[PDB]
Every structure is written in structure tokens, then in C-alpha cells.
Design a protein around this ligand. Structure first.
Ligand SMILES: Cc1cccc(Nc2cc(Cl)nc(SCC(=O)O)n2)c1C
Ligand SMILES: Cc1cccc(Nc2cc(Cl)nc(SCC(=O)O)n2)c1C
Length: 264
């Protein structure tokens, strides 16, 4: 029945995220292949195909950094939506207080985002636009400050995360564990969430034992990546606040505004 819990989480994962690791690595290996975005010329081409209403609105008059930022925001909104439904399908979660649900998701969504973002990254770039764009690490490094600092720390995390060779069945449990975290600020009923977390991590521990018998400390490694992600998000939010207050035209979508409000 612990395999029940694992298979349920995994199936809710396969069902709620449009992009999964199996699908992503196919696209990242080589009908409707991804348009490679590596300079301004290819960015403009890709935009004319994938966001024609925006181009018609004149977005290509804006700095490339602003369009990339708003592309990033749009993807974050979509993934928050998917993560919210995934969480809703985690055994015990929807039994939690409605206030604590919002708290767990508020603090957890970006840790889960950057964990799953590794699935669509390789050492040269990341998939965007539902698999129909591949924007290169170097083009993103090439942007003006502060925008060139957005993505490279996520690439750094992802290269070491992907070195662990986790599959979607591992990742789904990792993300569940990320979300069911008993030490978030603001939690009403911490004891239930800890009992929920304990149950998820126990399943994760058993699953890694079965699925990766060759990596002796993989479970402790993953706990450390959880700490690494929380520090990554803290730093990300500070760079995002710098851009919000400093960069005109880089306004914050309201769903994301509310996530960052009173976070760190
Ligand atoms: C890599 C990629 C793929 C598809 C489109 C775009 N450009 C975008 C994407 C989005 Cl969601 N938004 C914008 S500009 C938004 C605005 O200035 O109101 N520009 C980019 C930068
Ligand atoms: C799944 C995926 C792929 C590519 C980009 C994004 N969203 C990101 C990623 C990164 Cl490293 N940075 C941002 S800045 C805007 C925000 O804080 O949502 N947004 C996401 C969530």
C-alpha cells in the first residue's frame, strides 16, 4: 500500500505536467522540432511563430531581456497552475486546512519549479514554449545585467541534479516531498503536515532503495538538494525584486506577485 502511495503520486505527476522527463529528453536529443533561439535574429523568428499576437502588439520594439523575462513569467504561471493541481492530488493534501494548502504551495512552488526545470535543461540550453523552443545557455548568459543572472544558477543546479539520473517516478516523489514541508512560515497545523511529510519521505526512501540500488547515499543527497533549492529560491526572489523595482517594462504578473509577497 506504500506502493499505492507511490504509484498515485507518480500518476498524478504524469497527468498534471504537460512536460515530463521522458518527453523532454526525446526533444533534447534531436515533426514540429524546437526552434533554436541563440541570437536576436532567431529570437525574433521564434516569436513571430509562437506568440504572433504579441509581435502584432509590437513587443519586438522592447529589449530582448524584457521579452525573455515575460516569457519566463508566463511559464511560471502555467507551472504553478499545474503544481497546484498535482498537490491537490497528493494523498492527505486536500484534507489539510485550506489556509495551509496556500501556505505550502506559496513556499513550495518555486522549489518544485527549479527541480523540474532540470528535466528540460541540458548543458547548452532549455526547452521553452511547450517543447517548440530551445533557448541556449550562452544567449541567456549574453543578456545585459541583471537579466543574465536569472537562468545560469538554475543551469548550475540542474547539471548536478541531472547527474543523479533520476526518472519521473523519483522526481514526482521528490516534488511531493518539497510541497509537503512541515517547517514553512505561517503553518496552522504543523503536526498533520509533518505526519504527511514523514509518510512521503518514507515512500521516497523506499522507492530510491528499489529504483537506485547502486547509489548508496542517494536519499541524503536528495535531502541536500532540497536545502539547495530553498537557498536557490531565496536568491531568485531577491533578483526578481531587484528587477521589479528597477526595470521598467518588467512588471510582475499578479499570480506571481502574490507568491513573492511576504515570502522571504
Ligand atoms: C524564447 C521565447 C519564446 C517565445 C516567445 C518569446 N518572447 C516573448 C514571450 C512572452 Cl510570453 N512575452 C513576450 S513580451 C510580453 C510584453 O512585453 O508584454 N515575449 C521568447 C523570448
Ligand atoms: C518550467 C520553466 C521553464 C522555463 C522557465 C520557467 N520559469 C522561470 C524560470 C527561471 Cl530560472 N526564472 C524565471 S523568472 C520569473 C519568475 O520568477 O517566475 N522563470 C519555468 C517555470
Amino acid at each position: 500500500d506504500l506502493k499505492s502511495l507511490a504509484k498515485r503520486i507518480y500518476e498524478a505527476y504524469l497527468k498534471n505536467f504537460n512536460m515530463n522527463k521522458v518527453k523532454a529528453r526525446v526533444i533534447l536529443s534531436g515533426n514540429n522540432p524546437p526552434f533554436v533561439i541563440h541570437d536576436m535574429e532567431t529570437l525574433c523568428m521564434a516569436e513571430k511563430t509562437l506568440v504572433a499576437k504579441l509581435v502584432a502588439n509590437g513587443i519586438q520594439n522592447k529589449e530582448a531581456e524584457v521579452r525573455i523575462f515575460h516569457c519566463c513569467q508566463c511559464t511560471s504561471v502555467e507551472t504553478v497552475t499545474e503544481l497546484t493541481e498535482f498537490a491537490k492530488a497528493i494523498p492527505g493534501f486536500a484534507n489539510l486546512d485550506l489556509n495551509d494548502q496556500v501556505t505550502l504551495l506559496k513556499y513550495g512552488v518555486y522549489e518544485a519549479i527549479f527541480a523540474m526545470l532540470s528535466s528540460v535543461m541540458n548543458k547548452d540550453g532549455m526547452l521553452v514554449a511547450y517543447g517548440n523552443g530551445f533557448i541556449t545557455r550562452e544567449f541567456l548568459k549574453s543578456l545585459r545585467k541583471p537579466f543574465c543572472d536569472i537562468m545560469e544558477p538554475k543551469f548550475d543546479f540542474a547539471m548536478k541534479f541531472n547527474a543523479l539520473e533520476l526518472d519521473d517516478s523519483d522526481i514526482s516523489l521528490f516534488v511531493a516531498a518539497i510541497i509537503c514541508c512541515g517547517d514553512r512560515p505561517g503553518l496552522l497545523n504543523v503536526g498533520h503536515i509533518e505526519k504527511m511529510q514523514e509518510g512521503i519521505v518514507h515512500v521516497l526512501r523506499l522507492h530510491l532503495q528499489s529504483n537506485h540500488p547502486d547509489d548508496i547515499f542517494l536519499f541524503p543527497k536528495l535531502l541536500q538538494k532540497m536545502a539547495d533549492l530553498r537557498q536557490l529560491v531565496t536568491e531568485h526572489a531577491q533578483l526578481v525584486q531587484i528587477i521589479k523595482k528597477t526595470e521598467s517594462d518588467a512588471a510582475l504578473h499578479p499570480l506571481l506577485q502574490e507568491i513573492y509577497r511576504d515570502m522571504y
